[PDB]
Each structure stands twice: as structure tokens, then as C-alpha cells.
Write a protein that binds this ligand. Structure first.
Ligand SMILES: NCC(=O)N[C@@H]1O[C@H](COP(=O)([O-])[O-])[C@@H](O)[C@H]1O
Length: 201
């Protein structure tokens, strides 16, 4: 069973979906710890009501990214973590950390990368006026632009949509592909080749 750590910053709907899929009969992974850089967020309650230990590592208490990421890394090693899932984690990881976890850290983004990178993808989409958006799960890479893509699901944008409605429709897709992507990676079906490009059995 592959040990997983889910990093969060807020609500935790994606965390929840991963908990459910990991609690499924044939899952190849189990969530052994949940880390939040913000205290008092709902995702923390979801991990707790699930019997999953948590830690709040507040980035505001550190001097730089390196220091903050080192604290996080101490916990992951402490839990013999294999795979790291960034689920709503709103922090940019330091290069050495991303380097360390290359091929073992997945992130979920609410757009069809390379479109609408950064925060507020939904708002960007609606400002732009696309009729198709979606979500993407990928490996975290040195630069947030070369992250190897694992799975994506296109989601339609309705003409009436507000950030709330679109956002909700996109999360439904996210809960589908993050669990599947985790499974894909946890089971070894998907890996990062030596050339750094995605690889399937
Ligand atoms: N910086 C990346 C980013 O924008 N992530 C997105 O934030 C939301 C948090 O959801 P949740 O906490 O309910 O899983 C999710 O929709 C995720 O795709």
C-alpha cells in the first residue's frame, strides 16, 4: 500500500474525494497524513472525521520558502510518505523540494493547462469567454510550466455561469480525475520517464 500525504489550504473537497477512493477495496494507496499551511480550514475536519492525523505548518511563521518546505519535508519523512498530492495547496514549492519529490508529487489545477495558469483560473476563464474549461492533474516540475500532465477532463462553460457555478461544475470533474490519477501513479501504471516525459505501462 503506497503511503500518501495530501497538502491543503482550504475546504478539502478534493481531499475528501481522495479519502473515499483510497478507502475503496482495490486502492493501491492510503492517506497517512494531511498537512495544511492554514489552521482552522474545513479540510482539516474532513481528515480528522476520517481518522487521519493532521499538522498545520503555517508558512507565515517562516522566513522563506526553503525553511517552510523543510518543515513540511520533516513530517513527510516522519511518515515515510511515498506520494504527495497537492489538493488546494496554495503555496509555491521551492525547487529543491520539487526536485526531491520529482515524479512523486501530483497537483490538481482547475483549468485545462496550459490555459489559465495561476490562481483564479475560473475567473480568468469567464473574463476570457471560453465555452470549454476543465481541470488538470499533473506532476509538479521545477517550473510550473513543464509539469508533466497525467489526466484532464474538459468541462463546459454555460453562458449564465458565475464563478460559483462554474467552479462547482469543475470540482465535480476534479474529484473524478485526481483519484484516478493517484491510482494510476500509485499503482505504477504512470511514471515520469528518464527523459522527464510521462510514461504508461
Ligand atoms: N493553486 C491551485 C488551485 O487553484 N487549486 C484549485 O483550488 C480548489 C480547492 O478545492 P478544495 O479545497 O475544495 O479541494 C480546487 O478547485 C483546485 O482545483
Amino acid at each position: 500500500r503506497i503511503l500518501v500525504a495530501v497538502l491543503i489550504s482550504g475546504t478539502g473537497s478534493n481531499l475528501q474525494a481522495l479519502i473515499d477512493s483510497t478507502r475503496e477495496p482495490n486502492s493501491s494507496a492510503q492517506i497517512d497524513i494531511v498537512i495544511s499551511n492554514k489552521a482552522a480550514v474545513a479540510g482539516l475536519d474532513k481528515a480528522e472525521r476520517a481518522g487521519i492525523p493532521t499538522r498545520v505548518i503555517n508558512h507565515k511563521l517562516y522566513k522563506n520558502r526553503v525553511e517552510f518546505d523543510s518543515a513540511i519535508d520533516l513530517v513527510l519523512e516522519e511518515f515515510s510518505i511515498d506520494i504527495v498530492c497537492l489538493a488546494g495547496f496554495m503555496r509555491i514549492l521551492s525547487g529543491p523540494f520539487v526536485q526531491k519529490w520529482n515524479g512523486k508529487m501530483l497537483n490538481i489545477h482547475p483549468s485545462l493547462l496550459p490555459s489559465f495558469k495561476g490562481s483564479n483560473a475560473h475567473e480568468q476563464a469567464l473574463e476570457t469567454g471560453v465555452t470549454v474549461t476543465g481541470c488538470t492533474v499533473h506532476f509538479v516540475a521545477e517550473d510550473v510550466d513543464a509539469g508533466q500532465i497525467i489526466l484532464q477532463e474538459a468541462v463546459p462553460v454555460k453562458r449564465g455561469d458565475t464563478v460559483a457555478t462554474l467552479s462547482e461544475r469543475v470540482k465535480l470533474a476534479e474529484h473524478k480525475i485526481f483519484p484516478a490519477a493517484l491510482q494510476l501513479v500509485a499503482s505504477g501504471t504512470v511514471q515520469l520517464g528518464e527523459n522527464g516525459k510521462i510514461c504508461w505501462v
